[PDB]
């Protein structure tokens, strides 16, 4: 019973299909992992009866298997090394549950729809960092990072940079000093905002990703936004949560991202990677690693998580398929098959 910390990633260079869960009626799945177990979280099918539930990863989500953590139309989960944090929203209120007990709450700031990262959150020591957001998807939507300690909200972090619209952030650790997040951006652009959160200084900054590979959906053709790294290109309306994990090697940080194949519908799902660099100021295209999901199959939301091995962490990306969950992980080397 000791706090988790970011650790260097398990050796490997590629991703492969790891596990598929394909049948309760659930939506918007995610996975979160503690020191020795992974849980598959989803919301049980906006509506007062919606709930945040979980089953052990590898189980089929059924009523017999599922534990109901809290009422919620949206939510997240974390593990700080001593216990699980369950977070969710049902104006709107955000509730935080630690282990068995309800602890703090947070009220919509925008007095508008409140949502959180639909993903595992990121804990260092006993401090869990959660992205929350509100103001409506149709316009300006501001995100904040809540620093949660044993279920209590101790600090609210207001970001600088491009903050007019940040939603559904997929976060992971780049290093022991920082959390980075690949965010959704409705209304304004095909480029995902990228958040850098300094955990030593509890300071966040957001800039638009510079890469010419557009990651949100719908998107214009890659390389087709003749503007400075910061500009908003076409097809801003719509959008979807992207997968994103870090590969922390002793000397380099790899960054893995998901994208749909469709520039229109949410169809298929591809995997992209870049090693090293600094996305806020780096226009180079991401390398294509392979196809996680075929174009004839649904491919909606995707998320990152990391599996804890005994002495390293394994980056993994999950994909929602309207909904079944496919898991891909950084195991070994070679092409994704």
């Amino acid at each position: 019973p000791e706090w988790t910390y970011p650790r260097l990633s398990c050796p490997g260079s590629t991703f492969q299909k790891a596990l598929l869960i394909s049948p309760l009626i659930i939506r918007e799945p995610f996975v979160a992992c503690g020191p020795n177990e992974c849980k598959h979280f989803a919301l049980t099918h906006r509506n007062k009866l919606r709930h945040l539930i979980s089953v052990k990863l590898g189980k089929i989500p059924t009523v017999e298997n599922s534990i109901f953590h809290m009422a919620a139309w949206s939510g997240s989960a974390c593990h700080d090394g001593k216990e699980w944090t369950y977070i969710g929203v049902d104006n709107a209120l955000l509730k935080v549950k630690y282990g068995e007990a309800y602890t703090d709450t947070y009220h919509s700031y925008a007095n508008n729809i409140l949502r959180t990262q639909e993903s595992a959150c990121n804990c260092i020591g006993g401090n869990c960092y959660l992205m929350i957001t509100d103001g409506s998807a149709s316009g300006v939507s501001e995100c904040r990072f809540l620093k949660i300690r044993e279920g209590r909200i101790i600090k609210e972090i207001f970001p600088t940079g491009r903050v007019k619209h940040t939603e559904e952030c997929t976060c992971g650790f780049a290093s022991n000093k920082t959390i980075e997040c690949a965010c959704r951006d409705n209304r304004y652009t095909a480029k995902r905002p990228f958040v850098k959160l300094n955990v030593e200084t509890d300071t966040a900054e957001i800039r638009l990703m510079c890469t010419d590979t557009y990651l949100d959906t719908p998107r214009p053709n890659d390389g087709s936004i003749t503007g400075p790294c910061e500009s908003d290109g076409d097809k801003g309306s719509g959008g979807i949560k992207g997968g994103f994990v870090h590969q922390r090697m002793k000397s380099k940080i790899g960054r893995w991202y998901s994208r749909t194949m469709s520039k229109t519908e949410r169809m298929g799902m591809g995997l992209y990677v870049k090693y090293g660099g600094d996305p806020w100021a780096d226009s180079d295209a991401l390398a294509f690693s392979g196809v996680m999901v075929p174009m004839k199959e649904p491919g909606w939301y995707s998320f990152g998580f990391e599996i804890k091995d005994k002495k390293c962490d394994v980056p993994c990306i999950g994909i929602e398929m309207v909904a079944a969950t496919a898991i891909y992980c950084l195991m070994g080397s070679g092409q994704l098959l």
């Epitope: 300006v140 501001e142 600088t160 940079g161 491009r162 903050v163 007019k164 800039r207 510079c210 936004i225 003749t226 503007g227 400075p228 790294c229 910061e230 500009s231 908003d232 290109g233 806020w280 100021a281 226009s283």
Partner: antibody, heavy 121, light 107 residues
Framework: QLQEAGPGLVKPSETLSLTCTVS??????????WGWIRQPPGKGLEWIGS???????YYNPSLRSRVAISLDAPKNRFSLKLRSVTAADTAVYYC???????????????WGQGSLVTVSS | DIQMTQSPSTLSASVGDRVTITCRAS??????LAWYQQKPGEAPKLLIY???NLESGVPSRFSGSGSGTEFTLTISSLQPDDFATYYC?????????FGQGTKVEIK
Amino acid sequence: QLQEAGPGLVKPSETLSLTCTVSGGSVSDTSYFWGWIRQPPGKGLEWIGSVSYTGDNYYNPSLRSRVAISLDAPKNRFSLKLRSVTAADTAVYYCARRPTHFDFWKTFDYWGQGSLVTVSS
Amino acid sequence: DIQMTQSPSTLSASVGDRVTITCRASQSISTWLAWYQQKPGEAPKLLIYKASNLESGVPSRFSGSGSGTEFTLTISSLQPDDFATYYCQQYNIYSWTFGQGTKVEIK
């Protein structure tokens, strides 16, 4: 369209507060960034920062510990606040406006006149 | 940040002469390099947008071009009204940094 006003003198450790009045346009317009450029005597230009009505805000990282910019839409104006002014901060402070037109293709099309601020005991 | 250098820092040129000013970025800035004309006592006036394009109202004597790291501004015919200090900045990644600029003296 842009005009600076405020103290022409602060002493070390004091906060400098300069306000740029906007006319012939509006700070409430989401298509523009408003901001400040510094020019120390005998030197070239240093960018300080810029803000938008949409909430976006950027600052020069070497300064972004001591600076805040406020877009005061109700009075159609904006201001620069610099804490702990020490000495090397003596400069002409200019306000400027940057449209995000076409696709963010422009850099400060409109400029103010500038206000020279001396830092002294 | 991206450090930008301008050269020559001081320029002596005649009326009717041709002026070339070069900006050297330490990192690629794609094609987003802006140029300004600062007459002493005045706020800098924008001349150039995306390396070229040319700001409306600029006398057509001015034109820029370039890509990546090395860019130039030229004045097709130098006139006394072109006496100014000229500056350029990265206009891609944030922390827009200006070089020292150049002084253009007209003789």
